[PDB]
Design a binder for this molecule. Sequence first.
Ligand SMILES: CNc1cc(N2CCC[C@@](O)(CNC(=O)c3ccc(CN4CCCCC4)cc3)C2)ncn1
Lengths: 236, 195
Amino acid sequence: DYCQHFVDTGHRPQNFIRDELIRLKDELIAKSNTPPMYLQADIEAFDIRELTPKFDVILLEPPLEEYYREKCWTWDDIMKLEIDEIAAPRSFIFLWCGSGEGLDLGRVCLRKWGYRRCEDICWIKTNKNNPLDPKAVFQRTKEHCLMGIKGTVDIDLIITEEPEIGNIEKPVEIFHIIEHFCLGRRRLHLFGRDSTIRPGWLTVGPTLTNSNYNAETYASYFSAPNSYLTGCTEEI
Amino acid sequence: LFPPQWICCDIRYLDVSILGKFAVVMADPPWDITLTDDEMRRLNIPVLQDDGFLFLWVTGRAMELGRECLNLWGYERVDEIIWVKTNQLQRIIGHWLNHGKEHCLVGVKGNPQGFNQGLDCDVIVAEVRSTSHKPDEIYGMIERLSPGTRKIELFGRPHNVQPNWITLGNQLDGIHLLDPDVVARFKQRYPDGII
Ligand SMILES: CNc1cc(N2CCC[C@@](O)(CNC(=O)c3ccc(CN4CCCCC4)cc3)C2)ncn1
C-alpha cells in the first residue's frame, strides 16, 4: 500500500517505481532535423497566420497561473487562439493542461480547433528529495499533456523529480516522445523559451530574447523533394 | 449497516431510489469503447447523493463521455486519479503509446463538509492483480477522505465487497442487505424479490 505509505511518510507513491537498441531512429531524426528557428512574438497581439507553412505538429505550453503557485494565460485566453489557422489538414497537437480545470477546458480547446484526443500523457512528479487548490480533493502530483489528431515504442508516462519552486519547465522527454512518432518536420512550439529551443523545431514565444525566423527561409526547408518526410528517414 | 452488503442486479433496471443517500459513489462502467452511451447517460446517478463525491473510471473515449455524464449527473470534476500499473518488481507493466495507467475522475456535488481533503495524492502505484480488477488502494483513499460514511459502488464484482459499501453488479451472489432502512424499502418496492 503505497498510498498508506505516503500518508505515513510523505513519500509520494511514484518514488518507488523502478527503472533491443533503437538509437538509429534518434540519429535519423537528428539528421533530418531542420536548423532550429525561433521568433519572439507576443502571441496575444500576434496574427498567428504569419507563421507559415501549416504545421505537422504543434506543441502548446501556455503559462497557466497555476504554474506560479509560490503574464499568465487563462483558458479564456487560450481558447481564443486560432490554432486551426496554422494546423495542417492532417496534423497533431500536444497541449499541456496542468492538473486543474485545464484537463476539461483543454479538451474543449482541442475540439474547438478541430482535433480529437488520442492520448493522455501524464507527467508524474516524484518528491524523493523533499518528502492545495480550493477545489482539490487530493494532493496534485502530476501534469497532463493531451495529444490531439486532426485528419486521417513509448509509454504515456513521464516520471521525473518535481522541479524546484518557480521552475515552470516541462520535461524534455515530451520532445523525444513527439519526435519518435515521426509525424513530419514542420514542428511549432508555442510559448517556448530560450531554454527550449531545439533542432527540428520552430519556437515562438514572448520571452525569447532573439529571433531568426524567416517565412521564406523556413518554408525552404520543406520544398521538394522534402515535402512529406516523416522526419525519421534519410535525406532526400 | 457497517458490514459488506450487495445486490445482484442490472443497474439499468434497479430502482436505486430505495437505497438512500451516500457520501461517496464509485463506478467502473462497461463503456462502449456494455451499456450504450444513452443508457450510461440515463442511469439515475442523481438520486444517490446530495453532497459528496463520485469516483468514475474512464478509458479511451469514455475519458470524454464520462466527463459528459459527470456534468450531466450534476457533478463538477475537481480531480483526476491515475493508477500506474506495475508488477512485483515495481516496473511499469490507444494506437500511439503503450498504456501505463487507468484514469478515475473525481466529481464533487453540492458542498460536502467534514471530509479529509488533501490526505492522499492523485497517483496510485499498485500491482495488477487479476485483469479488470481495480486496486484496493482506492478504498483506502476513499475511507481516509470520508471515514465511516455510506458508500456505493456501481458495476462492482464479488471481490469488491467492502464494509461501509453496498455493491451493485450483475455477477454478484444474490441480495445481501443489513441496513434496516434499505431492507424496508426493498421489501416495500420489491415484495416478491424479483426485479
Ligand atoms: C448490463 N448492465 C449491468 C452490467 C454490470 N456489469 C457488466 C459485467 C461486468 C460486471 O459484473 C463487473 N464489472 C467489471 O468486471 C469491469 C471491470 C473493469 C472494467 C475496467 N476497469 C478496469 C479496472 C480499473 C478501471 C477500469 C470494466 C468493467 C458489471 N453490472 C450491472 N448491470
